[PDB]
């Protein structure tokens, strides 16, 4: 199938571009308190979220040779009422089609951020109450109508200052696959 090859190549070049947008370097200066990013777990789509108070790694991994360099970045997602019901269950749930729940701070892993956009919302102090934390949500759904073509992302070529070679190779490969897609 022409489209099967097309799809496969497209999504391989897709998977290639990341792991450079979220790293211990070229990323942590961007994770501002108010930056807008994405979160993509296996089979889970939370939506949009606002980074808040990313914290230094609490290394506990017995990797026996590595330095356990995973970072815990905290974002403000609307995961689930069902998931805030039980605090002891170490798991989150994506946004159900049901009642829209409440906003809470989820310390997701850096390797989960699919995209790191440029739109940076203003964050209010005193994010302890439940009502003002909804003021963020109504602001998010604001920007999504200001840009009806999707929120602009941060291409690492010109905007993040990525100077490596492999990412350039993958960019060339995806451009080639795109120009090949014209002949469907």
């Amino acid at each position: 199938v022409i489209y099967y090859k097309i799809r496969q190549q497209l999504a391989k070049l897709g998977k290639e571009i990341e792991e450079y947008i979220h790293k211990p370097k070229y990323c942590l200066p961007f994770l501002q308190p108010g930056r807008l990013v994405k979160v993509k777990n296996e089979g889970d789509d939370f939506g949009w979220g606002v980074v808040v108070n990313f914290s230094k790694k609490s290394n506990v991994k017995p990797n026996s040779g590595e330095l356990d360099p995973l970072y815990v970045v905290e974002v403000l997602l609307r995961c689930s009422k069902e998931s805030l019901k039980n605090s002891a269950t170490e798991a989150a749930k994506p946004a159900k089609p049901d009642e829209k729940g409440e906003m809470q701070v989820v310390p997701v892993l850096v390797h989960l951020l699919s995209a790191i956009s440029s739109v940076r919302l203003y964050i209010p102090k005193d994010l302890r109450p439940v009502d003002n934390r909804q003021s963020v949500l109504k602001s998010i759904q604001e920007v999504q109508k200001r840009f009806p073509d999707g929120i602009p992302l941060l291409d690492p070529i010109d905007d993040m200052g990525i100077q490596d070679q492999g990412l350039k190779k993958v960019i060339q490969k995806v451009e080639a696959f795109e120009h090949r897609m014209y002949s469907h």
Partner: peptide, 29 residues
């Protein structure tokens, strides 16, 4: 960000014990 001159972290409760990692990568934070 805990000693820089410009950054300033808000306040929050943060009781959401144990992250949800990917597949079999449960990390004891």
């Amino acid at each position: 960000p805990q000693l820089s001159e410009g950054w300033e972290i808000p306040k929050y409760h943060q009781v959401f014990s144990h992250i949800v990692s990917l597949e079999g990568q449960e990390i004891q934070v």
